[PDB]
């Protein structure tokens, strides 16, 4: 079966793959409502995933936000502790997510652009209040259903306030210049990157800064915004030091026809300074998302979250246990 769930719920369809592991839209036996469901098939044997599935648990148990994706429940262990093996998290069900809608010969106008861009910044507002920056921001990331309604997913990769750039990979379409160009200071800035390249994205229906490798994904940031500051960078800075004066190309002439207004923020979020960009509460006092902006209703996250646990280096049965902790915890607080 290689989902022996209890009763509680019924599975319907796999939906697909995370990298680890599997989600399954259910429905929940009582009341007949439509859940999805990620098992995680060995989630204690690797020291780096245990430590991902705890962090992420922890973070989507402290937030409770439209826009960010939520647990429903997380089941108990149906066996020994020494024997449990498996972990399955009950999760809200979306229908697609943006990478789907934005490459599809479905019509894609600016008001869907406009909807989608205030719940990501509503809902990065909430998150950035609690310390969290999300760091792996993408339209595959954020969730989203036949209204429009959107949540954000995925926060394995999320941190407070080691890696390494490979070549050859083409994985960092979304990824900020100080994530690149290694910068001593990493802040919330960082999804606000991310945010730009993804609403660029919904504007023409085509990524942004498509690289193929680390050096052509440096070479498509500086075409369009041009060479950084020398104030803007401090082996690695001889690369871009020596390379001729490069001015910003205005976004008007890379995006033909596009929105006044939608620019202008646009232009806010995409700049090499981390400083320099908007943050998302301030973001959301531009005119471009004015239809919806409501002061009452794009609350913050208090308290913020700790990444004590995180720092603690813990072996891989002691993050074993932290996570057991975390499902009885759970329970205890609803029940
Ligand atoms: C029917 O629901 C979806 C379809 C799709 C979708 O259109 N695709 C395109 C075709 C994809 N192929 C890869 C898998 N193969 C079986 C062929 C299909 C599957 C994903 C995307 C998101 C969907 N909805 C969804 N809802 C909830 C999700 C989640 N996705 N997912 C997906 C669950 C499938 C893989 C990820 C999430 C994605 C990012 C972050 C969090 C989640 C998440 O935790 N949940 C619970």
């Known amino acids: 079966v290689t989902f022996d769930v ?8 796999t939906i697909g793959n995370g990298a680890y592991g599997v989600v399954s839209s259910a429905r929940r036996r009582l009341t007949g409502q439509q859940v999805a469901i990620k098992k995680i098939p060995n989630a204690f044997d690797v020291v780096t995933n245990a430590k991902r599935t705890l962090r992420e648990l922890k973070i989507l148990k402290h937030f409770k936000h439209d ?18 093996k498996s972990v399955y998290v009950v ?8 990478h789907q809608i934005i490459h599809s010969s479905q019509p894609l106008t600016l008001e869907h652009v406009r909807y989608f861009l205030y719940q990501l910044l509503r809902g990065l507002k909430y998150m950035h209040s609690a310390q969290v920056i999300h760091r792996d921001l993408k ?29 050859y990979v083409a994985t960092r379409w979304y990824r900020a210049p100080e994530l690149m160009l290694s910068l001593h200071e990493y802040t919330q800035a960082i999804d606000l990157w991310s945010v730009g390249c993804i609403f660029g994205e919904m504007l023409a229906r085509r990524q942004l800064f498509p690289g193929k490798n680390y050096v052509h994904q440096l070479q498509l940031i500086m075409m369009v915004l041009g060479t950084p500051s020398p104030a803007v960078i401090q082996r690695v800075r001889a690369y ?9 190309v205005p976004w008007e002439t890379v995006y033909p026809g596009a929105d006044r207004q939608a620019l202008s923020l646009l232009g806010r979020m995409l700049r090499f300074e981390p400083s320099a960009r908007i943050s998302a509460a301030a973001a959301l006092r531009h005119p471009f998302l004015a239809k919806y902006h ?22 891989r049965e002691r993050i074993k246990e932290a996570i057991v902790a975390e ?8 029940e």
């Open 67 to 84: 826009n960010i994706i939520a647990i429903k429940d997380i089941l108990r262990p149906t066996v020994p502790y020494g024997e449990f």
């Open 294 to 315: 409501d002061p009452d209703d794009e609350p913050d996250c208090a308290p913020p979250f700790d990444f004590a646990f995180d720092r603690e280096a813990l072996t």
């Open 240 to 248: 871009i030091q020596s390379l001729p004066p490069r001015q910003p």
């Open 327 to 334: 499902i009885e915890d759970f329970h205890a607080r609803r």
């Open 139 to 167: 339209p595959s990331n954020l969730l989203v259903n036949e209204n429009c309604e959107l949540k954000i997913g995925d926060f394995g990769m999320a941190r407070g306030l080691q890696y390494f750039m490979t070549e």
């Open 6 to 13: 209890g009763d509680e719920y019924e599975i319907i369809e």
């Open 91 to 98: 999760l809200d069900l979306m229908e697609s997510d943006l």
